[PDB]
């Protein structure tokens, strides 16, 4: 009923709209080590698990830098072009925008910030990542955020695993 | 008697990176590998009254990386042989009214789950060369693989499938797929996923959370319990009309249908025999069959020709005992 009648009579495709969301992850490692990984826009494969290859032509690390990414198989995309928008070494913030590729994430920009946070007596890091993107044709706001958050959560989980392993090796 | 004949394994294989940035496909062929208990093969309508040699063929189409498909290549058939040995011993002692299809079901389900738990670091696993077992993930949570597996013996083909790789039998003049793709737009899969609290989203095809185009696979713990490692098994008595059996990743199937693949494989196998003397009987079944290899080679070339931008893995298996050309 309700949801059915609506899906049949009131389903219109808007020339365009944009959705947004935020995710969080606690990482059991000091922020400097976490940031040493995250700041490397030119090497996202250090922790982003779906990246098979990344090429940066020209200046590698500075606002305006452009990275070309090839993705591992299984995703609804194979490549992406991203530009570094924000690289704040004072506040530990990294902002990117997607400007090309064969995904369906148009006008995608995102922001990750790091914050110190102690839990269970161990000092670590709270990573926060948000994004904003155009809802593609045929999909809803909710659907678009399920997809992106799936991707982002995977990125954060890997970030946490990589930096925690590094921190363990350091201790030794 | 068919349960008495020598089963000589004739196959060819191609597994190439193709137009992809990295290789995530893997495969395994193990001739004369298994000892299948006749009681798991003979049908009820047949007479009563030890084991048939079984050949193993497997194709693993990795996603999110290569480590799961590789692990499957290295381990899955050994896991399966462990499981067959288990059931074989129980069947020697007790006997339910278990249909054949039900028997193979439980063998493959246990085997696929065992490999999956080992990968996730939940099940203790042996390491080659080491006396010690380890409890440790073989790959990160975002890596997975399909698995399509075929056991061939004189009387039967048994196929166990998990994912959207595919096994296809050419019988007479008709393709007969021996697996059904595990895709989220299957009503059973859609309901399983949605009832478990997951989302199926239209995004370049129906995808689990918009990410994965298959609803089952080995690995992919990040998307458990939505994608699961549970296979479906097909139990298929052989026929004199059977021509060949093909296992392949989607680097092939995305650009050609089942019927054209079979027709092409059979034709290339036949063309090889028209222009070549039969190989030495003694050395037959000890390595790849050149007719089958020509067929798998030609299919991979054709797939690339047709714009396949993926890894391409194909195993072609000839099911005819012999291929002579009567004339005069
Ligand atoms: Mg593939």
UniProtKB/Swiss-Prot annotation, chain A:
PANTHER family in alphabetical order: ABSCISIC ACID RECEPTOR PYL10, OS08G0374000 PROTEIN-RELATED
Membership in a protein family:
Belongs to the PYR/PYL/RCAR abscisic acid intracellular receptor family.
Instruction: From the record, give the cysteines joined by S-S bonds.
Output: 19-145
Output the InterPro entries linked to this UniProt entry.
Answer: Plant_def-hormone_signal, Polyketide_cyclase/dehydratase, START-like_dom_sf
A GO CC annotation recorded here is:
plasma membrane
- Gene field: PYL10
Q: Where is this motif: Gate loop?
A: 73-77
Residues in the signal sequence:
none
State the Gene Ontology terms under molecular function: abscisic acid binding; protein homodimerization activity; protein phosphatase inhibitor activity; signaling receptor activity
User: What are the recorded Gene Ontology BP terms?
Assistant: abscisic acid-activated signaling pathway
- Assembly mode: Monomer. Forms heterodimer with PYL13, thus antagonizing PP2Cs-binding and ABA-independent inhibition of PP2Cs. Homodimer. Binds ABA on one subunit only. Binds to CARs protein in an ABA-independent manner, both at the plasma membrane and in the nucleus. Interacts with ABI1 and HAB1, and possibly with other PP2Cs, in an ABA-independent manner.
Q: Which organism is it from?
A: Arabidopsis thaliana
Span(s) of short sequence motif Latch loop: 103-105
Give the residues the record marks as binding abscisate. Answer: 48, 77-82, 104-110, 129
Q: Which residues does the annotation list for site: Involved in ABA binding?
A: 49, 96, 148, 151
Q: What is this protein called?
A: Abscisic acid receptor PYL10
UniProtKB/Swiss-Prot annotation, chain B:
Q: Taxonomically, which superkingdom?
A: Eukaryota
Q: What induces it?
A: Repressed by MYB44. Induced by ABA.
Name the protein family. Answer: Belongs to the PP2C family.
Kindly list the positions annotated as binding Mn(2+) 1: 61-62
EC nos: 3.1.3.16
Name the chain's protein.
Answer: Protein phosphatase 2C 16
GO molecular-function terms, A-Z? metal ion binding; protein serine/threonine phosphatase activity
**Originating gene:** HAB1
What GO terms in the biological process aspect are recorded for it?
Answer: abscisic acid-activated signaling pathway
Q: Quaternary structure?
A: Interacts with SWI3B (via N-terminus). Interacts with ABA-bounded PYR1, PYL1, PYL2, PYL3, PYL4, PYL5, PYL6, PYL8 and PYL9, and with free PYL2, PYL3, PYL4, PYL10 and PYL13.
């Amino acid at each position: 009923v309700e949801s059915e009648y609506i899906k049949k009579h009131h389903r219109h495709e808007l020339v365009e709209s944009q959705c947004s969301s935020t995710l969080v992850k606690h990482i059991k490692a000091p922020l400097h080590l976490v940031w040493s990984i995250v700041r490397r826009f030119d090497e996202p494969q250090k922790y982003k698990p779906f990246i098979s290859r990344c090429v940066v032509q020209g200046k590698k690390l500075e606002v305006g830098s452009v990275r070309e990414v090839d993705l591992k198989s299984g995703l609804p995309a194979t490549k992406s072009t991203e530009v570094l928008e924000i690289l704040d070494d004072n506040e530990h913030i990294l902002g990117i925008r997607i400007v090309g590729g064969d995904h369906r994430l148009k006008n995608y920009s995102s922001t990750i910030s790091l914050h110190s946070e102690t839990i269970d007596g161990k000092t670590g890091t709270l990573a926060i990542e948000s994004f904003v993107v155009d809802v593609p044709e045929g999909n809803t706001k909710e659907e678009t955020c399920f997809f992106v958050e799936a991707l982002i959560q995977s990125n954060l989980n890997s970030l946490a695993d990589v930096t925690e392993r590094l921190q363990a090796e350091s201790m030794e | 008697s068919v349960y008495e004949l020598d089963c000589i394994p004739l196959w060819g294989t191609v597994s190439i990176q193709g137009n992809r940035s990295e290789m995530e496909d893997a495969f395994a062929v193990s001739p004369h590998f298994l000892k299948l208990p006749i009681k798991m093969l003979m049908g009820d309508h047949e007479g009563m009254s030890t084991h048939l040699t079984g050949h193993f063929f497997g194709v693993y189409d990795g996603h999110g990386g290569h480590k799961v498909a590789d692990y499957c290549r290295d381990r899955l058939h050994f896991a399966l042989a462990e499981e067959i040995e288990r059931i074989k011993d129980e069947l020697s002692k007790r006997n339910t009214g278990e249909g054949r299809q039900v028997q193979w079901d439980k063998v493959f389900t246990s085997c696929f789950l065992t490999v999956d738990g080992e990968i996730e670091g939940k099940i203790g696993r042996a390491v080659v060369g080491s006396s010690d077992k380890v409890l440790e993930a073989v790959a990160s949570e975002t890596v997975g693989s399909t698995a399509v597996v075929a056991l061939v013996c004189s009387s039967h083909i048994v196929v166990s499938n998990c994912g959207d790789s595919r096994a296809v039998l050419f019988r007479g003049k008709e393709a007969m797929p021996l697996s059904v793709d595990h895709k989220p737009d299957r009503e059973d899969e859609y309901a399983r996923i949605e009832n478990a609290g997951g989302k199926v989203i239209q995004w370049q095809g129906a995808r689990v959370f918009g990410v994965l185009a298959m609803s089952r696979s080995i690995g992919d713990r990040y998307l458990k319990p939505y994608v699961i490692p549970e296979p479906e098994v097909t139990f298929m008595p052989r026929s004199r009309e059977d021509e060949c059996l093909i296992l392949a990743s989607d680097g092939l199937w995305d650009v050609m249908n089942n019927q054209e693949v079979c027709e092409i494989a059979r034709r290339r196998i036949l063309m090889w025999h028209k222009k070549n003397g039969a190989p030495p009987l003694a050395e037959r079944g000890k390595g790849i069959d050149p007719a089958c290899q020509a067929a798998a080679d030609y299919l991979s070339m054709l797939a690339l020709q047709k714009g396949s931008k993926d890894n391409i893995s194909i195993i072609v298996i000839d099911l005819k005992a012999q291929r002579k050309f009567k004339t005069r």
